[PDB]
């Protein structure tokens, strides 16, 4: 399977340098050009550039030429974005992605990474149990989840027993409070017959803070 | 829907041993679509950059494609010296560019061992007979057979093309179909190779009643 | 430099045919801009559709086919269906560099309403002894994508500490929300309950939770 | 309606020149899929006689490539008769990754079948200067190109022989050579070579040739 992860996102001081990495894997990395494209909050895509498989040529959005650089290590099977003295209109979702060896230039796609452009305080994130009782119970299943509250910056994943629990899994879009943290929830639905055999384990990460919380969530007494 | 293919050949063997005469590498790109208006080819001799190839315009074939040639021509030495050619086809629809490599075979080079065998006497019933010429013991395959009688060009023969014998050499047989009449009133045909390890890169055999 | 223009939005049935453009400010689109379509999913999840004006990428359904008309270059959707609804990126080449266009939203008719599923958790205990209360009001699997949230504190209204999210279209094409009231534990302890009310398309879903 | 880049490829083989031509053996029609994915692994296979569908075909199993994909075949025991007659095998691939079945037909090469005419051709005489000679068994005028060939003595195949691939004549029919080396001393001492040949239209599928000094 073809796979792109893109890392090194989070927060950055305007005027501040940041180099992205996108790790490939499931495919031979030194056939194909690569591409990065960003998509800034509320905006269209916005292509920044590409590079050759043997790095001979890279080509950049002309007005964005000053502020990137792109590289790649083929024998590492990795590509770099180096961001330079970043403004505002910098954050955004970083994407590297891999043309099809004929046709689509932008076929497969990385998550992307987040990068965030502030002067703000990094913040991790509080993690509160949202225990499942005869209340959180519909039938034949029941809910319950984690309040992950008061962190900066985006974003926040949560897994459920380490990814064995997949399932029913609800993360919700974060709420951006007046205060400038954001705080979000994540539900997992479970069989109501299966309350009071175990306990769970919500695996909240907060890459921006260093921080990862893996919070017990148990049933109602 | 996979789009362009590419085909390197080598030069034409008789091209490669006359000085005279031009070899070239030939790449080639089919399943070019109307939608590929550009088809790029880098040339690269042991790796380094080239300049002197030559793109001939799009020929259209008759299952709506278009056939793309780039022609490299190469020093005789070169080719026989074992140099290795690298074409590399590129566009903005070519994610990935297509690289295909071609060089002379590698190791001692083996003069061919030329003989020429009559019709056997089963085929004399027939109203034409076959003249046989065997080429064996021969390294690289590169190599090239016709045919003469009186001074003049024989063209009704066929080649097969060179066989990888058990010693690591190759082997091919030529033969040229005759009237009998032809054969039976003493008429002297000659079977003639080019190979790089023959004599001035040449060599004949002649056969007659 | 360039600029390439696309639709806002667009809408379709399934079963019809619709034609989404593109189109470059520098005079007529051709085979040498080499015409990219790109399709963006819920948790942006982009995949690439076109390259090359009019080839697939691999698993890309054949009702998708990309062409060039006059002076724009199009992406035709033959027989839409459901899960096509999405934003839709065209991307032209100038020589040496790519420009994608603003993007067209396309919305598919049709779908039946679908009314929000509510789950309000109260404060947990941990954060009633960090001197903090949240009720967490979650919506989800509603159609279409506008709803309109209401709290009590026992049956008086409640404005101050409510924060609510805009929804989102989630993969299945409905939409999800969040709700957020922060409360004193003194205000949480003092009520008899608290409810979270969800009006979609007129009609009210209320959950009520309570310190006992 | 085209499939899209990156999918499954089907290649449709016919059974072997030799399986065909003797009852003893038995010829079969392979079905081989490549590019077959981890994500979608599952290959069903239908095959048809002339239109009509059977199942007495093997799916193999699985052989894991090095490029990280499936390579998945499928073994149809085919009758001797059917295939020479000019019975058209078709193979129905179905798989996750596909749009729609991809559809191969195989059948014997359409056209008069012609009889093969086996020449045994001696060593040059500039040839017997050398430690090792070359018997040549010329095979021409033959249609369809599916021909088996044999150099043996004794009842056993020779070490050593090699023959050429079918060339299309000028007549539209097709000619081989097949080269056997000996050491000189067994041609000077009067052993006999022979090349034995099986074609559809030979008589009994069947014809050998003997060559001695
Ligand atoms: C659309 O049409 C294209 C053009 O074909 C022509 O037009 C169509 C409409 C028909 O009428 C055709 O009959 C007609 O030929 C097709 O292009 C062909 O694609 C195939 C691959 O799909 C190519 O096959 C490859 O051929 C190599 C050998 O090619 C030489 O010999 C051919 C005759 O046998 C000759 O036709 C070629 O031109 C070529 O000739 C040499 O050219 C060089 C350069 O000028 C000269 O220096 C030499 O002297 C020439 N020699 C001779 C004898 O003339 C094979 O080597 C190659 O094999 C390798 O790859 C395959 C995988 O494909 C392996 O199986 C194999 O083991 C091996 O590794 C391969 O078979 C073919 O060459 C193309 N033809 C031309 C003219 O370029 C398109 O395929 C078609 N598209 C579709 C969608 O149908
Ligand atoms: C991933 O790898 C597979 C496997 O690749 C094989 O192994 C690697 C290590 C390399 O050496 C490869 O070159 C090698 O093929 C790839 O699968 C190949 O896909 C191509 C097309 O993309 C097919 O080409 C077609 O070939 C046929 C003729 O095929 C026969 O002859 C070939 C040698 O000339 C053999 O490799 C084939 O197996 C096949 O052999 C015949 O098989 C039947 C039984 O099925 C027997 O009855 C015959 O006797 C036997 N004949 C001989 C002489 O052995 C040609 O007509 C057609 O035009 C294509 O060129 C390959 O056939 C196919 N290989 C195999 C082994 O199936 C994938 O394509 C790779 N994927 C990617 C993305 O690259």
């Given at each position: 399977?073809?796979?792109?992860?893109?890392?090194?996102?989070?927060?950055?001081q305007?005027?501040?340098?940041?180099?992205?990495?996108?790790?490939?894997?499931?495919?031979?990395?030194?056939?194909?050009?690569?591409?990065?494209?960003?998509?800034?909050?509320?905006?269209?895509?916005?292509?920044?550039?590409?590079?050759?498989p043997?790095?001979?040529?890279?080509?950049?959005?002309?007005?964005?030429?000053?502020?990137?650089?792109?590289?790649?290590?083929n024998?590492?099977?990795?590509?770099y974005?180096?961001?330079?003295?970043?403004?505002?209109?910098?954050?955004?979702?970083?994407?590297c992605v891999?043309?099809?060896?004929?046709?689509?230039?932008?076929?497969?796609?990385?998550?992307?990474?987040?990068?965030?452009?502030?002067?703000?305080?990094?913040?991790?994130?509080?993690?509160?149990?949202?225990?499942?009782?005869?209340?959180?119970?519909?039938?034949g299943?029941?809910?319950?989840?984690?309040?992950?509250?008061?962190?900066?910056?985006?974003?926040?994943?949560?897994?459920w027993?380490?990814?064995?629990?997949?399932?029913?899994?609800?993360?919700?879009?974060?709420?951006?409070?007046?205060?400038?943290?954001?705080?979000?929830?994540?539900?997992?639905?479970?069989?109501?017959?299966s309350?009071?055999?175990?306990?769970?384990?919500?695996?909240?990460?907060?890459?921006?803070?260093?921080?990862?919380?893996?919070?017990?969530?148990?049933?109602?007494? | 829907?996979?789009?362009?293919?590419?085909?390197?050949?080598?030069?034409?063997?008789?091209?490669?041993?006359?000085?005279?005469?031009?070899?070239?590498?030939?790449?080639?790109v089919?399943?070019?679509?109307?939608?590929?208006?550009?088809?790029?080819?880098?040339?690269?001799?042991?790796?380094?950059?080239?300049?002197?190839?030559?793109?001939?315009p799009?020929?259209?074939?008759?299952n709506?494609?278009?056939?793309?040639?780039?022609?490299?021509?190469?020093?005789?030495?070169?080719?026989?010296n074992?140099?290795?050619?690298?074409?590399?086809v590129?566009?903005?629809?070519?994610?990935?560019?297509?690289?295909?490599?071609?060089?002379?075979?590698?190791?001692?080079?083996?003069?061919?061992?030329?003989?020429?065998?009559?019709?056997?006497?089963?085929?004399?019933?027939?109203?034409?007979?076959?003249?046989?010429?065997?080429?064996?013991?021969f390294?690289?395959?590169?190599?090239?057979?016709?045919?003469?009688?009186?001074?003049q060009?024989?063209?009704?023969?066929?080649?097969?093309?060179?066989?990888?014998?058990?010693?690591?050499?190759?082997?091919?047989?030529?033969?040229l179909?005759?009237d009998?009449?032809?054969?039976?009133?003493?008429?002297?045909?000659?079977?003639?190779?080019?190979?790089?390890?023959?004599?001035?890169?040449?060599?004949?055999?002649?056969?007659?009643? | 430099?360039?600029?390439?223009?696309?639709?806002?939005?667009?809408?379709?049935?399934?079963?019809?045919?619709?034609?989404?453009?593109?189109?470059?400010?520098?005079?007529?689109?051709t085979?040498?801009?080499?015409?990219?379509?790109?399709?963006?999913?819920?948790?942006?999840?982009?995949?690439?559709?076109?390259?090359?004006?009019?080839?697939?990428?691999?698993?890309?359904?054949?009702?998708?086919?990309?062409?060039?008309?006059?002076?724009?270059?199009?992406?035709?959707?033959?027989?839409?269906?459901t899960?096509?609804?999405?934003?839709?990126?065209?991307?032209?080449?100038y020589?040496?560099?790519?420009?994608?266009?603003?993007?067209?939203?396309?919305?598919?008719?049709?779908?039946?309403?679908?009314?929000?599923?509510?789950?309000?958790?109260?404060?947990?205990?941990?954060?009633?002894?960090?001197?903090?209360?949240?009720?967490?009001?979650?919506?989800?699997?509603?159609?279409?994508?506008?709803?309109?949230?209401?709290?009590?504190?026992?049956?008086?209204?409640?404005?101050?500490?409510?924060?609510?999210?805009?929804?989102?279209?989630?993969?299945?094409?409905?939409?999800?929300?969040?709700?957020?009231?922060?409360?004193?534990?003194?205000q949480?302890?003092?009520?008899?309950?608290?409810?979270?009310?969800?009006?979609?398309?007129?009609?009210?879903?209320?959950?009520?939770?309570?310190?006992?």
């Amino acid at each position: 399977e073809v796979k792109l992860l893109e890392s090194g996102g989070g927060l950055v001081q305007p005027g501040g340098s940041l180099k992205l990495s996108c790790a490939a894997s499931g495919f031979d990395f030194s056939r194909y050009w690569m591409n990065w494209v960003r998509q800034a909050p509320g905006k269209g895509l916005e292509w920044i550039g590409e590079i050759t498989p043997d790095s001979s040529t890279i080509n950049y959005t002309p007005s964005l030429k000053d502020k990137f650089i792109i590289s790649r290590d083929n024998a590492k099977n990795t590509l770099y974005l180096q961001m330079i003295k970043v403004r505002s209109e910098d954050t955004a979702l970083y994407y590297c992605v891999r043309p099809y060896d004929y046709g689509a230039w932008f076929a497969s796609w990385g998550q992307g990474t987040l990068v965030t452009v502030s002067a703000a305080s990094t913040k991790g994130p509080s993690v509160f149990p949202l225990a499942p009782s005869s209340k959180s119970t519909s039938g034949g299943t029941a809910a319950l989840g984690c309040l992950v509250k008061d962190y900066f910056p985006e974003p926040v994943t949560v897994s459920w027993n380490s990814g064995a629990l997949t399932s029913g899994v609800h993360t919700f879009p974060a709420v951006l409070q007046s205060s400038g943290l954001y705080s979000l929830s994540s539900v997992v639905t479970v069989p109501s017959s299966s309350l009071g055999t175990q306990t769970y384990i919500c695996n909240v990460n907060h890459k921006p803070s260093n921080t990862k919380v893996d919070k017990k969530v148990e049933p109602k007494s | 829907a996979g789009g362009p293919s590419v085909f390197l050949f080598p030069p034409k063997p008789k091209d490669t041993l006359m000085i005279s005469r031009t070899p070239e590498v030939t790449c080639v790109v089919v399943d070019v679509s109307h939608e590929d208006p550009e088809v790029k080819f880098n040339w690269y001799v042991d790796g380094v950059e080239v300049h002197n190839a030559k793109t001939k315009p799009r020929e259209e074939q008759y299952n709506s494609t278009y056939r793309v040639v780039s022609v490299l021509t190469v020093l005789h030495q070169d080719w026989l010296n074992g140099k290795e050619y690298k074409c590399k086809v590129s566009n903005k629809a070519l994610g990935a560019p297509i690289e295909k490599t071609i060089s002379k075979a590698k190791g001692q080079p083996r003069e061919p061992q030329v003989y020429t065998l009559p019709p056997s006497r089963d085929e004399l019933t027939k109203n034409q007979v076959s003249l046989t010429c065997l080429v064996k013991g021969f390294y690289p395959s590169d190599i090239a057979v016709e045919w003469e009688s009186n001074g003049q060009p024989e063209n009704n023969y066929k080649t097969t093309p060179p066989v990888l014998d058990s010693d690591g050499s190759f082997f091919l047989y030529s033969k040229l179909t005759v009237d009998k009449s032809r054969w039976q009133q003493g008429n002297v045909f000659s079977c003639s190779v080019m190979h790089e390890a023959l004599h001035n890169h040449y060599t004949q055999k002649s056969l007659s009643l | 430099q360039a600029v390439v223009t696309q639709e806002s939005a667009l809408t379709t049935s399934p079963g019809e045919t619709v034609t989404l453009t593109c189109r470059s400010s520098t005079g007529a689109v051709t085979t040498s801009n080499y015409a990219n379509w790109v399709q963006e999913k819920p948790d942006h999840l982009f995949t690439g559709l076109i390259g090359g004006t009019n080839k697939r990428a691999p698993g890309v359904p054949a009702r998708f086919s990309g062409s060039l008309i006059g002076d724009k270059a199009a992406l035709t959707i033959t027989g839409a269906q459901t899960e096509d609804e999405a934003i839709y990126f065209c991307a032209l080449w100038y020589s040496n560099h790519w420009v994608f266009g603003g993007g067209t939203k396309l919305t598919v008719l049709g779908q039946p309403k679908a009314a929000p599923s509510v789950t309000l958790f109260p404060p947990s205990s941990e954060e009633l002894q960090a001197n903090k209360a949240t009720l967490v009001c979650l919506i989800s699997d509603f159609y279409p994508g506008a709803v309109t949230v209401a709290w009590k504190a026992d049956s008086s209204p409640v404005k101050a500490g409510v924060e609510t999210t805009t929804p989102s279209k989630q993969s299945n094409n409905k939409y999800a929300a969040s709700s957020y009231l922060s409360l004193t534990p003194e205000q949480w302890k003092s009520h008899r309950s608290y409810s979270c009310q969800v009006t979609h398309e007129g009609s009210t879903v209320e959950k009520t939770v309570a310190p006992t």
